[PDB]
Amino acid sequence: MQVKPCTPEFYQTHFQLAYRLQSRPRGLALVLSNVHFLEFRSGGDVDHSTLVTLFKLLGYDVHVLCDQTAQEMQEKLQNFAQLPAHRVTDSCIVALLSHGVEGAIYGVDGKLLQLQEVFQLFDNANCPSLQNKPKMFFIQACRGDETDRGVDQQ
Amino acid sequence: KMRLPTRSDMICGYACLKGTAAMRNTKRGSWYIEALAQVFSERACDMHVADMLVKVNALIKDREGYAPGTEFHRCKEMSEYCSTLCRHLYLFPGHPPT
C-alpha cells in the first residue's frame, strides 16, 4: 500500500475552506476488531491489517484492540476518547469491526454496545478536546440479518 | 459567545444499510474495508473524505456475492455515510514533505 501525497499547491488552494488538518500526527486512530465469538469472522484479520496500515500511512497514531467484550469496548473507547493527545491533534478516527445489529455492535461475549453510546463518548460535552474537530467513524458490522438479493436493472 | 450543539463534526461510514447484512470475503476481507482502503490510499491526496465515501458507495453498488449453493450467491450490499460535518474534510497526506 502507498498513499499518494497531496501537492503543496493543492494544500494552498484548499486549506482555507477545510477543517484545519496539519498536526503531526493528524490524530489518533483506533481500530477495534472482533473476530472470535456469531460465527468466526474469517478475513477479519485482513481488514484489521489493512486499516492499521492505511491509517499509519495517512499520518495517524494507531491504537488497536482485538476480541473485546461489550464492556471492555465501552471502557476502552472511553479511555481512548479521554486521551490528552486529542488537544494537540486536528482530527480523530475510530473503526469498529464486528458482528452487529441495527444501532449496535457485538462484544466477543455476545453482548451489545449501542452506537449512540459510542458517538456520545466523542461528542462536544464529553470530549471537549475534539470540539470543532472532524471525527471519523467506520463501522464494519451487519445492521440486520436480511440478505439483499439484488434487483434487475431495467 | 458562540456555543456548540451537543454533537457535531462527525462523519460515520457504514458497511451496509439499516436492516441489512454487510458482506465479507473469507480471504480478501470485508467488501467495505477493501473499497475504503483502495479509495483512500489513492484519492486522499485530492478528494475530501465525504467525496471518497461516495466513491466507495460506487464500488460497493457494483459488487456482488460469489458463494455458489448458498443464499449469498449473487447477493448485493449498499454502503452509506451519515454526516454532521460543517466543512470539507481533506486529510492532506504527506504535506508538508520531508
Binding site: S42, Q140 | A22, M23, R24, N25, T26, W31
Partner: peptide
C-alpha cells in the same frame, strides 16, 4: 462471501 458471507454475512457480518
Amino acid at each position: 462471501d458471507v454475512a457480518d
